[PDB]
Design a protein around this ligand. Structure first.
Ligand SMILES: Nc1ncnc2c1ncn2[C@@H]1O[C@H](COP(=O)(O)OP(=O)(O)O)[C@@H](O)[C@H]1O
Lengths: 533, 103
């Protein structure tokens, strides 16, 4: 109608799409440009003009939460708190919501995941239902995409229905426009603690499913990734790089031509073989055309992008490649300067490799039109980012991820003050330590964490003493000081004994002994002044 | 999920009469029937909660009884049903009456 036309010309994406659907060129192009338009920043990074991210989340009678409201950052949000505060519950809530986008990008009227009647409803909820309400943002044309997941407890007074239509509507735009002309698609992924799992050596050979673009959405929100799928896909990429498809077409074309000449020469026995070869040729051309039709990055380029990402983000890995050993393809890595198989990697290295490899694979598959596919859009959830990492890696991990995936919204959980030392306080959302489930707002810490000392973050943000209070030796310096002050600053028998204990335990060069020495010096001087007076 | 009246029609015309289903069901009914107004029960639960260590097991039993009573109260005419204790007794008598050499 005229109203839709005005709103669409004003830059409203839904109105433009509705006009496209009813008339089914200009409206199509508007929708496509809204999704595809972007610019390169001063750092050489592509930036979409219309960003997509989760802006707000509200939880009502969900697990431990009677009511919780969270505002999220466009780039990075870190949730911190003690064990059992509901950090994982928050990520699960988001993941379920994202499942509705994924389902509807894949299939019209696809269903995402529902809240559990048994586990997701708060135990003492008066209303005996749970709500997960989320609001998404997609550029100035679509400032609010509200979604609500609802579930009623088993006894059932009344049905509380979920409201998912806006998710479906938005996902429909992506699906339909992509069908007509290939567009870049958003990546959604959850990496929970299940990512820590043993590697199976037995690589199933390429049946064909891993090369399909929408395999990138397969089990994206299941928690583990699919590192097995990566390995299969990567070996596949390698084999295709060693063997060109057009030469096979040219060779097949030559074979078909030779067989056609034989059939024309009176050998009717080879007609069956000719028909088979013509079929094979047509299939090869179709695959080539589909590959051509998909407007896709070359297999060589795809391989290179992923390899670079892995080597840049994973500190111990300097190189990754496929070897033909014996009669079976093996992925090898240069780890800590030595060539090893994936099965030889430490659990920390493997788990982190798995995360990055999986994410990179999906981004390459979903962003074929970008020069750097890792600059695509998406929302990635990571539980316990520090899992299996030494402190030295914890100091690098957030920096590396954000550098490799500059346009992803990361929502992460951590217990690590070392991680927090690399992050701005605005990105941090902290639970109150004494929270008995009746807290409306998660809040930022008062101290600036980025560039701060770890000991300070322990005490000021994580509410933990820098020294273990249930060790006696931790109190000796305090006790020593008190004894010195009780005896007008002179080392008495008791203070000397404790001094010797401190010396014996911590050592001659210890900070503790130096502090004790300092106390002696200062107190002696103070006493001398007092006597002069 | 709790048992519901029209579950009686589930797999009635193929899949019925399997021994494992019986045993599971029977043990379940026994556990529930091992050990009555809602307001009175609500009052008893409240009194027991105020007392609450040795009475904690009794409180949990009474809370369960209260929840069941509320559920039965809330449940519809179309799903209205005999007590688990009665159901158990009828089935036991049926088995012993019908099956050769089981007393
Ligand atoms: N349905 C529920 N009702 C009440 N409390 C629950 C429910 N489900 C979980 N909890 C509580 O919530 C906590 C689990 O939250 P979780 O997200 O695993 O914690 P975190 O990620 O901070 O370690 C535990 O303290 C548990 O007792």
């Amino acid at each position: 109608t005229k109203q839709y036309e005005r709103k669409a010309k004003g830059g409203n994406l839904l109105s433009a799409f509705e006009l496209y659907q009813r008339n089914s060129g200009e409206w199509f192009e508007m929708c496509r440009d809204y999704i595809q338009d972007g610019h390169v920043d001063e750092s050489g990074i592509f930036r979409p003009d219309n960003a997509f991210y989760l802006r707000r989340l509200t939880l009502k009678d969900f697990r431990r939460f009677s009511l919780l409201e969270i505002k999220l950052e466009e780039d990075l949000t870190v949730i911190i708190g003690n064990n059992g505060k509901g950090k994982t519950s928050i990520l699960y809530a988001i993941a379920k919501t994202l499942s509705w986008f994924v389902a509807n990008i894949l299939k019209e009227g696809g269903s995402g995941q529902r809240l559990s009647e048994m586990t997701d409803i708060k135990n003492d909820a008066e209303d005996r239902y749970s709500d997960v309400s989320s609001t998404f943002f997609f550029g100035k044309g679509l400032k609010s995409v509200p979604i609500r997941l609802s579930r009623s407890a088993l006894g059932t007074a009344e049905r509380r229905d979920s409201e998912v239509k806006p998710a479906k509507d938005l996902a429909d735009i992506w699906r339909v426009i992509n069908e007509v002309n290939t567009i870049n698609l958003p990546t959604f992924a959850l990496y929970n603690v299940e990512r820590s799992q043993p590697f199976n050596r037995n690589i199933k050979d390429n049946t064909g499913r891993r090369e399909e673009r929408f395999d990138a959405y397969s089990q994206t929100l299941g928690g583990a990734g699919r590192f097995d799928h990566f390995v299969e896909w990567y070996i596949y990429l390698h084999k295709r790089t060693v063997s060109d498809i057009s030469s096979s077409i040219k060779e097949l074309e030559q074979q078909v031509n030779d067989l056609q000449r034989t059939v024309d020469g009176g050998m009717v026995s080879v007609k069956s073989l000719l028909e088979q070869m013509k079929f094979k040729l047509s299939e090869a051309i179709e695959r080539n055309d589909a590959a051509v039709s998909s407007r896709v990055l070359t297999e060589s380029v795809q391989k290179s992008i992923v390899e670079k990402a892995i080597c840049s983000v994973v500190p111990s890995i300097s190189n990754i490649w496929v070897e033909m050993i014996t009669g079976s393809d093996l992925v090898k890595v240069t780890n800590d300067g030595h060539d090893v198989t994936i099965d030889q990697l430490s659990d920390g290295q493997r788990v982190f490799l798995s995360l990055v490899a999986d994410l990179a694979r999906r981004m390459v598959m979903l962003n074929p039109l970008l020069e750097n596919p890792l600059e695509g859009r998406g929302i990635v959830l990571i539980d316990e980012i520090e899992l299996h990492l030494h402190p030295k890696w914890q100091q690098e991990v957030i920096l590396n991820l954000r550098s490799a995936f500059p346009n992803i919204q990361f929502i992460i959980t951590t217990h690590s003050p070392i991680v927090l030392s690399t992050i701005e306080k605005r990105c941090i959302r902290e639970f109150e330590p004494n929270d008995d489930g009746d807290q409306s707002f998660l809040d930022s810490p008062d101290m600036q964490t980025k560039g701060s000392e770890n000991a300070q973050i322990l005490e000021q943000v994580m509410n933990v003493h820098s020294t273990p209070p249930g060790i006696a030796e931790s109190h000796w310096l305090g006790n020593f000081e008190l004894l010195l002050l009780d005896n007008s600053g002179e080392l008495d028998n008791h203070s000397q004994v404790l001094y010797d204990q401190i010396k014996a335990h911590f050592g001659i060069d210890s900070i503790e002994l130096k502090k004790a020495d300092s106390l002696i010096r200062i107190n002696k001087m103070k006493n001398k002044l007092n006597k002069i007076r």
